[PDB]
């Protein structure tokens with residue numbers, strides 16, 4: 001019954017127990033309860049990047065294989081933009097850092113810098129939307145520091161997530177402006193259409209999002225009773241379990257009750273809700289309740305004699321533990337679908353609050369490591385010098401003293417505090433220059 | 446301009462020239478014009494198998510890896526059915542027979558034989574629907590002979606296609622009833638829920654469909670001018686090309702014309718039609734017409750001064766070469782979408798007619814090899830003995846005399862002729878037994 005470790009006490013053991021008991025992985029094989037999430041991501045993110053104008057393709061490091069073809073295909077300005085995406089499998093913590101995983105990576109080349117920069121952020125919005133709209137996970141959109149960007153590019157943009165149980169940042173996905181670096185390496189060039197004396201190099205970007213989203217989702221929403229599945233990616237959204245069946249239930253009445261479960265299932269599915277029944281009567285209803293609790297099914301309908309007689313469903317909401325009575329009539333599928341949208345909203349809100357609570361604005365060095373030790377991320381004033389970023393990570397690792405304990409930069413958030421950074425000195429110990437921005441620091445995955 | 450070999454004269458060179466000039470493959474890399482087809486298949490077939498109740502998953506020969514897990518997961522009858530699908534890439538003629546390709550394969554295990562048999566045919570209907578409804582390719586649904594089935598199973602069902610240019614059958618996809626063979630190998634078992642003294646073995650099936658569908662599609666519909674893309678899988682369904690622009694076109698009038706192309710594009714896309722413009726004016730309109738002809742864009746809109754003035758689009762239909770005038774007004778997107786549905790219908794009809802014309806019912810041995818040599822498939826009476834099937838292939842190979850020349854069985858069609866087989870002797874040379882069925886024979890891919 002339940003889960004063998006609390007998140008607050010032993011997070012690694014909690015996570016392994018959850019992913020196993022919820023039937024997400026088999027020691028990895030990705031079983032359907034987890035895979036459905038990836039299928040949802042593929043549909044949703046796939047749709048968005050198609051709609052932007054990116055096309056899918058299949059290639060048998062991606063850049064070393066692809067960019068020679070880009071050179072070949074770009075014969076003149078009329079071949080631009082080249083905008084290609086691939087869904088594939090790249091070759092440990094399951095769904096966080098693994099030897100094999102699935103992802104999507106896009107590579108584009110444009111005639112102008114503006115075009116390339118604009119797509120970089122469009123794609124980042126898509127990734128943000130994945131986390132927020134599908135997975136109910138809040139993110140920080142921002143830009144990586146020089147130190148933390150993708151080495152082959154000009155700048156890297158990111159959606160940074162927060163793992164409360166361990167007080168660590170996790171990079172959610174990234175979108176890179178590669179500028180003209182790679183065109184120079186791979187001899188990607190075209191004649192300027194307005195001046196045939198001159199050769200230009202396209203502006204390239206690349207961007208990827210992987211099954212890491214699933215691990216983030218688990219870590220963000222799971223609780224001490226098990227997984228809590230965001231409803232938009234829950235393979236089963238509602239489980240229907242018969243209750244109140246005893247020694248003295250007549251066969252007429254037992255049949256009716258089971259039949260009503262099937263009927264309910266049918267009515268919900270016809271209304272678009274992913275419902276199913278659990279009619280394994282060799283297990284108690286309690287055992288069945290636990291099984292689906294651990295999986296994180298968003299809603300459980302307990303259908304007994306009185307629910308039948310009163311045409312009134314008893315609904316247990318997994319994330320909140322709340323209980324609702326929902327009328328069983330023509331409006332039931334819409335009502336349940338609305339309750340699933342509220343569930344999304346509430347899960348997102350609760351996670352966002354937790355995130356913001358654990359984002360701590362630190363202006364004095366002496367409070368930096370104690371803040372980390374409170375399992376918080378830190379927003380601190382920074383002058384922008386790499387040396388200062390390096391000193392923060394060194395000094396924080398040395399004061400803290402098997403995961404890393406030094407704090408790195410996570411991103412420079414696009415949404416900056418109202419409080420001006422310029423009023424403060426750069427955060428590093430002994431530093432004196434006026435800050436120019438706030439940057440988000442933390443211990444990280 | 447155009448294609449360098451006729452289908453009727455050198456089919457291999459024709460096919461290579463098409464797939465290259467239509468930008469389908471790069472020597473394979475699957476470029477978007479072809480990949481979009483696979484994306485369409487994934488959506489359509491994916492949807493159907495989800496709706497049947499199959500779930501997707503990810504495993505790092507599939508049976509040797511998967512079936513031990515099936516043994517593990519099936520702890521009792523309450524774990525059945527296990528119904529799992531994977532979209533992945535397995536490791537020459539591009540899209541026909543290649544070292545690497547993409548496919549989908551499903552593996553199910555059920556408690557009862559009836560359940561397993563029923564799904565086998567449901568899945569086969571899905572595959573038939575792929576070819577027919579997406580790709581406008583006709584098929585023969587049938588059962589493989591004992592000799593031609595998947596060796597590990599009890600029986601194999603198939604959708605067989607016909608390649609007219611070379612007079613050969615091509616297996617389109619297969620769905621296998623594996624019975625209890627594999628459960629015995631892999632110790633997949635459960636206690637009979639109605640008798641706990643007894644152990645039962647589940648009934649399994651497996652089924653796959655690959656990017657071979659794309660090669661079949663090309664071979665079936667392509668003509669001597671290039672590819673002809675079925676409209677439901679055409680990445681671009683309508684191409685808009687400006688025409689009638691001369692030395693003396695004023696800049697006011699050139700701007701208006703280009704703007705009207707963009708506007709048309711916008712109006713069609715808003716109505717659900719995949720339209721785009723080709724405004725590369727460094728090429729003649731003729732050159733542009735050829736380029737999209739070779740790619741097989743279903744409809745071309747030629748938008749000139751008079752089309753603008755008369756609010757009347759000149760539409761060239763790729764498969765038929767027909768020309769239509771389509772009014773440019775509020776109804777244009779629906780009208781064009783309807784014309785694209787007619788295009789689907791017509792392509793399917795023309796291919797079906799060709800197929801049926803080349804299906805020849807042969808009752809005398811002496812006409813068998815000459816029929817093959819007419820680039821036809823053959824429906825012939827068969828007693829059902831493997832020996833007779835073997836003799837047909839031997840005798841046909843010996844009389845015909847670098848592809849194979851012997852005829853194999855393709856399938857026993859579920860749709861049998863009205864003419865009773867029993868009226869005839871088995872087809873093989875010298876054979877004497879009354880036939881029990883008609884079977885489809887041919888030279889094959």
Ligand SMILES: [Mg+2]
Nearest residue numbers: 146153154155
């Ligand atoms: Mg730089």
Ligand SMILES: [Mg+2]
Nearest residue numbers: 164358374375
């Ligand atoms: Mg905390």
Ligand SMILES: [Mg+2]
Nearest residue numbers: 363423424425
């Ligand atoms: Mg200060």
Ligand SMILES: [Mg+2]
Nearest residue numbers: 591598599600
């Ligand atoms: Mg047998």
Ligand SMILES: [Mg+2]
Nearest residue numbers: 609803819820
């Ligand atoms: Mg012929």
Ligand SMILES: [Mg+2]
Nearest residue numbers: 808868869870
């Ligand atoms: Mg006879």
Ligand SMILES: [Zn+2]
Nearest residue numbers: 383388426431
């Ligand atoms: Zn500084």
Ligand SMILES: [Zn+2]
Nearest residue numbers: 828833871876
């Ligand atoms: Zn015979």
